[PDB]
Structure formats: C-alpha cells, structure tokens
Amino acid sequence: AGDTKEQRILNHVLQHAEPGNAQSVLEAIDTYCEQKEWAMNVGDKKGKIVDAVIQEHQPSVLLELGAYCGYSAVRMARLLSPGARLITIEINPDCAAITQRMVDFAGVKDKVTLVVGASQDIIPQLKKKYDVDTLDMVFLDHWKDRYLPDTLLLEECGLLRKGTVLLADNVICPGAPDFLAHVRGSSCFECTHYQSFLEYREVVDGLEKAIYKGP
C-alpha cells in the first residue's frame, strides 16, 4: 500500500532484504529508519545489548510486550535454539499484521507466537491459553506507563520464577522512572543498567535488566 510508515518499512524490506535471512531484514529496517523515517524499533545499537542478554541467559520461553513491525521479534527469534518459543503481544491489529509478514519473510515463523490484544488482558491468559508455566525472559517495550503495572501483573499471575529475566527498553527516553524505582527498590529483583542511546539518535537512553529472585 505505502499508506502508513509501518507499511513503508515493510515494503522496503520486501524490496531489499533476502527472504529467510533475519540479519538482512534487520539491516534493511535499520537503514530505512536511519535514512528516511525514524521509527521506534529497538534498533541495532540497543539490539546488541538485547543480543548479549539473550546469549547469556539462553531463554526457551520468551515473552515480548509490544511487537510493532516485528523488528525485535526477528532480532530475538534468530538467536533462539530449536524448540524455543517467543510469544509477542501487540495491541494494534495493523502492527500485528505487519509483524506476522515480517517474521514469515525473515524465516523465523516457527519460533514466534503473535497474539493480538492488550498485554494486561493477554498476560493473565498465558497459563490458560498459551501453554505457559513460568517465563524464562520478558522483553518490555510497549507504552512505558505499562511497565510497572505489567511487571506487578506478571508476578501476581505466577509467571515469574527465581531466575526469570526482565529486560526493559527506553527506561531513560521516553523513560519509565516508576518501573525503575520498583525493580531497583525491591529485594525480589537484581538489576543492571545498560546506558546507550535512543534508536537512530544521539539522545541518551538505556535498558534495565531485572532478574527475579523469587517471592
């Protein structure tokens, strides 16, 4: 179509990336967003921090909040082992449609379960509908005012265990100070900050890793 920025990001990938080649898809999205239209993909610089977290902790059951065009889903899915699952939750059904196409194009279809709906509604269904016991890792990257209540909801729903890894993008810009005060101030988390930059910009941003210690 070319009507929305999201459709234009996808079109660019369709025109320039190699199918089945996750790295190719990510480079194409990053190039377009660096050069033509800024978009809220975690991007390549903060992407390397995301990579490093996945490579250290090696999650088999991963949850992502906020899928957008599929950039981070592809980024994380490409590093996952055979049999590993990425469940990604996306509120905007038009973003979701782009994400499925992006994931299919990149060759990581079988790693990904895309769910359309609000994280606050879908999180408490994970046990009942999606075969989840507890989560290995969660990537928080949706509207920043949802970080705190969704972390509280994840805990309450029984989805965190000793060693569950939370990784939150944008804890500086646009920021999530209430979420940070909670995880850093609670003895139930061990936290690490990764200072970086907002995607495609020179504005300072950061990620926070928070490891659940158990209740």
Ligand SMILES: C[S@@+](CC[C@H](N)C(=O)[O-])C[C@H]1O[C@@H](n2cnc3c(N)ncnc32)[C@H](O)[C@@H]1O
């Ligand atoms: C930063 S974008 C996601 C970017 C993506 N993680 C990446 O790096 O490629 C934020 C997304 O979260 C979605 N979102 C916002 N609130 C949500 C919620 N409560 N539940 C699920 N998705 C939500 C928005 O529609 C938007 O697509």
Ligand SMILES: Cn1c(-c2cccc(-c3ccccc3)c2)ncc(O)c1=O
């Ligand atoms: C979501 N997001 C955004 C973004 C873009 C528009 C609005 C909001 C938002 C909405 C409500 C409360 C707080 C923030 C956030 N910018 C950069 C990212 O990397 C990202 O993941």
Ligand SMILES: [Mg+2]
């Ligand atoms: Mg982000």
